[PDB]
Structure 1
Amino acid sequence: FPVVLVINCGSSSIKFSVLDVATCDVLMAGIADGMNTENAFLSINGDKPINLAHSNYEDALKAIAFELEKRDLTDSVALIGHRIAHGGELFTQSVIITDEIIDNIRRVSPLAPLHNYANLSGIDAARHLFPAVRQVAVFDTSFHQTLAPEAYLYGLPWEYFSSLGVRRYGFHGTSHRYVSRRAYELLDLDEKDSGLIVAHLGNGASICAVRNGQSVDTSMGMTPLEGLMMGTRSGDVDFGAMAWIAKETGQTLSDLERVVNKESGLLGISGLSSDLRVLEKAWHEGHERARLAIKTFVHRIARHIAGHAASLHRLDGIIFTGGIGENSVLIRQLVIEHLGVLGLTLDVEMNKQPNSHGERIISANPSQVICAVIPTNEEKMIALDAIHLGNVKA
């Protein structure tokens, strides 16, 4: 009864899950949190916030490793999956982790230094604690590697691309990939003659155009800062505006980077919260800046969905996913009503249904494009990649 241990070893946390290989069901989940800090803890299933004060990335996983052993799981771990933030141009698919892969992840790390050096910290720990276990790296950029240069180039001087690697990469690749594969079933589409837009709407948020099974445009950039407005991120912002602000307030690029990344977005406009549930209720209670944040948020989503549609030969489906996309009856409806130009017709009884109803269509019959909600499952996508790679000879 083999299992897969999935790890996302972020800048300040290690989220993990243990999935059964035969059914891909979660048997255990958890989050080590407050990493590299004095107050570090490990909450499995939100059941016993066990203190692990002053603990590194390997300590957290050595904690977790014991918890699997306390449950006799350690000896069924046949595979380990690692979520990697950034694969630059080197990674176009998931790979069995070897010394070469480590070097290569290390080479692309300058593109996402905070997050990639935490991913490597996690691989290092896992390799120690599970030496006879095959391990697999799954990159959030890799699905977007099929973008053409016209879709990934910035209008900067060519020098910045060829010597410094400045180009669009895009993220949420594992979600976009997973969700698009699931849409071909739900919508009864032929992958190889199909056109989808996937709106991954969580705390971080991005659109992806998937033409014939392949990503052909996505909204995030070299960094997660491009495209949609999100929880705390501004989304697309006029560089001339940012330069004008600099002069006016004395702020530096670094300062404004923090603002754009940590204090902007739903949080920034509303002045209340990055949380959409909080803001939905605030609007309901007559809050005006909450209403503006959401309307702005919706408008930028509508605008990118339509804009990413231009990279398709035909639009068969729009799929919503993520915490916001799976759960917000309002935002889904607002966005879809903002896309009447594309011929969309919402079915509000279908749109009203909670996420418990799973993969589900939410558009009427007259609708020229199918709209659906498809809960993402990144941990399952990582495990399926791991399972496949478990049959390989290295």
Structure 2
Amino acid sequence: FPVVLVINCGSSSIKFSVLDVATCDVLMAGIADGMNTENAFLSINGDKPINLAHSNYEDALKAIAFELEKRDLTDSVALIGHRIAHGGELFTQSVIITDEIIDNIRRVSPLAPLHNYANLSGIDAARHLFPAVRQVAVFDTSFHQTLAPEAYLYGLPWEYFSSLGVRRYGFHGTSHRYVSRRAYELLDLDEKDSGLIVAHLGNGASICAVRNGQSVDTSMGMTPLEGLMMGTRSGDVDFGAMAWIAKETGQTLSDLERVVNKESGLLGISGLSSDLRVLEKAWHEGHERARLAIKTFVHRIARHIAGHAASLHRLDGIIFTGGIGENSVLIRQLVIEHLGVLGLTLDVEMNKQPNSHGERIISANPSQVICAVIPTNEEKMIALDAIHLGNVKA
């Protein structure tokens, strides 16, 4: 009974999942958080954080690998899937990892210095500890590679694009790809003749316009920073306003990049929390700045959902997904009420239902556009790619 080992080897931590091939369901999931810092620990299923301190990426994965053998699961690992942050222009689909692939990941790595090098560390580790196991690289940008130049060009001098690689790449590709696939079945649509908007709201937040099965426009830019306002990310911001701030308070570009990543977004406007559940409660208890942050949040999503609709010949579906997307009854409704212009009528009985109801329609019949909630499963999509690439012979 073979299994797929999924790895999101981020900068600060190493997340992992062990999916069964037969069911595509998680048998085991863990995390190696606080990496390289004096005390690094491994928390599998959340039962006991074993302090594997004084250790790096190579041994943290060797700690996870030993625990797989503790559960007699090592011998059953047929495939390993690696989540990669940035594919650049070089990667349009998931690939079997060879030396050539490692090189090409290393080539585009300047575009995501924090994430990509951390991903490569995890690739080497898994390659070392499991050499006779087929390994797959799944990229977080590759879905958005179907974008036409008018969709991905910035209004900068052409040289910044041709020699340096400055363009729109977009992120949450795997999520957007997964959810879109699921929507065709749920909504009973023809992939070859369809237009969807997918709102991935959660950790980061992004919108994708999926036309006839292809990503044609997406909210995020070169960095995960452009687009929607997020938990701690500012979203769309006037560069003139930024340059003004840098002059008025005398801050370096380095200062502001840290401000826009860590101090901004929902956290920034509310001055309270980056967490929705806290801000939803905060508003319910007469907090204006938490209410404002949500109202702004909802507005920018509503702006980008309608915006991205332009890249469709027809609008069949708006799909909510991700932590906030799947669970927030409020945000979903405020967003939809904001889009009455698109002819949306929302069934509030259906919108009430918690996430346990999984893939569900949430718009009433008179609606000209079908709204739905689809739980995102990046782990399942990574596995499916790996299983598919498993049958191939390289």
Q: Which moved more, 1:149-158 or 1:55-64?
A: 55-64
C-alpha distance in structure 2 between counterparts of 1:59 and 1:351, whole Å: 46
Does 36-45 or 108-117 show the bigger shift? 36-45
SS in 2 for 1:51: coil
Tell me the residue number matched to 2:53.
Answer: 53
Distance 1:198 1:306 in 2: 11
Helix, strand or coil for the counterpart of 2:24? coil
Per-residue CA deviation, residues 339-394 of structure 1 (Å, 9 max, x unaligned), is 00000011001001000000000000001000000000000000000000000010
Tell me the CA shift for residue 36 of structure 1: 1.5
1:109-162: CA deviations, max 9, x gaps? Answer: 000011000000000000000010000000000000000000000000101000
CA distance in 1, matches of 2:380, 2:46: 21
In 1, Cα distance between the equivalents of 2:98 and 2:81?
13
Residue 209 (structure 2) aligns with = 209
What CA distance in whole angstroms lies between the structure 1 residues aligned with 2:60 and 2:354? 35
Mapped to 1, the partners of 2:217 and 2:267 lie a distance apart of 27
Aligned position for 1:379: 379
Mapped to 2, the partners of 1:5 and 1:81 lie a distance apart of 6
Residue of structure 1 equivalent to 2:105: 105
Alignment RMSD? 0.4
What residue is the counterpart of 1:272 in the other structure? 272
Q: Secondary structure at the match of 2:160?
A: helix
Shift of residue 22, structure 1, vs aligned partner: 1.0
Residues 81-107 of structure 1 deviation map (CA, whole Å, 9 limit, x = unaligned): 000000000000000000000000000
Equivalent-residue separation in structure 2 for 1:373 and 1:363 (angstroms):
10
How much has 1:59 moved relative to structure 2?
1.2
Aligned mates of 2:2, 2:342 — CA distance in 1:
47
What CA deviation, in whole Å up to 9, does each residue of 1:25-80 have, x standing for no partner?
A: 10000111001211211111111111111210111100000110000000000000
The SS at the match of 1:222 is coil
Q: Deviations over 1:243-285 (max 9, x none)?
A: 0000100001110010011110001111111100010000001
Instruction: Report the CA distance between 1:323 and its aligned residue.
Output: 0.2
Q: Any gaps of 5 or more consecutive residues in structure 2?
A: none
Q: Distance in 2 between matches of 1:54 and 1:377?
A: 33
Pairing 1:181-260 to 2, within 5 Å after superposition: 181-260=181-260
Query: In structure 1, what is the Cα distance between the partners aligned to 2:266 and 2:67?
Result: 37
Q: Distance in 2 between matches of 1:42 and 1:8?
A: 14
Q: Give the Cα–Cα distance (whole angstroms) in 2 for the partners of residues 53 and 286 of structure 1.
A: 44
Distance in 2, matches of 1:35 and 1:327, equals 30
CA distance in structure 2 between the partners assigned to 1:114 and 1:232 by the alignment: 17
User: 2 CA distance for matches of 1:248 and 1:283?
Assistant: 32
Counterpart-to-counterpart distance in 2, 1:50 and 1:199: 37
Q: Matches of 1:258 and 1:168 in 2, distance apart?
A: 21
Deviation at 1:10, TM superposition (A): 0.2
**The residue matched to 2:246 in structure 1 has which SS?**
helix
Counterparts of 1:298 and 1:217 in 2: how far apart (Å)?
A: 20
Residue 166 of structure 1: CA displacement? 0.3
Comparing 211-220 with 45-54, which one deviates more in the overlay? 45-54
* TM-score normalised by structure 1 residue count: 1.00
Aligned length: 394
In 2, distance between residues paired with 1:61 and 1:342?
49
Q: What is the CA–CA distance in structure 2 between the aligned matches of 1:388 and 1:203, rounded to whole Å?
A: 28
* Structure 1: gaps spanning 5 or more residues: none
- Quote the Cα distance in structure 1 between the aligned partners of 2:198 and 2:304: 11
Aligned with 2:207: secondary structure? strand
Q: Residue 169 in 1 paired to residue 169 in 2?
A: yes
Distance in structure 2 (CA, Å) of the matches to 1:91 and 1:54: 35
Find the aligned partners of 1:304 and 1:220 in 2 and give their Cα distance: 11
The 3-state SS of whatever aligns with 1:178 is helix
Counterpart of 1:96 in structure 2 is 96
Separation in 2, partners of 1:116, 1:41: 22
How far apart are 1:7 and its partner, in Å? 0.2
CA displacement at 1:328 relative to structure 2:
0.2
Tell me the CA shift for residue 203 of structure 1.
1.7
Q: Secondary structure of 2:236's match?
A: coil
Q: Distance in 2 between matches of 1:4 and 1:130?
A: 12
Within a 5 Å distance, the mapping from 1:66-145 to structure 2 comes to 66-145=66-145
2:44 aligned residue: 44
**Aligned mates of 2:248, 2:69 — CA distance in 1:** 58
Please state whether the residue corresponding to 1:363 is helix, strand or coil: coil
Paired with 2:385 and 2:104, the residues of 1 have a C-alpha distance of: 19
In structure 1, how many angstroms separate the alpha carbons of the residues matched to 2:52 and 2:235? Answer: 36
The CA distance in 1 between the partners of 2:281 and 2:63, in whole Å, is: 39
1:165: Cα distance to partner? 0.5
CA distance in 1: counterparts of 2:131 and 2:244, whole angstroms: 54
% identical aligned pairs: 100
Q: Which residue of 1 aligns with 2:301?
A: 301
The Cα shift of 1:2 comes to 0.2
SS state at 1:29 partner: strand
The separation in 1 between residues aligned to 2:57 and 2:347, in whole angstroms, is 47
Distance in 1 of aligned mates of 2:339 and 2:164:
38
Q: Deviations for 1:316-343, whole angstroms, at most 9, x for unmatched residues?
A: 0000000000000000000000000000
Q: 3-state DSSP class of the match of 1:216?
A: strand
Three-state SS of the structure 2 residue aligned to 1:50 is: coil
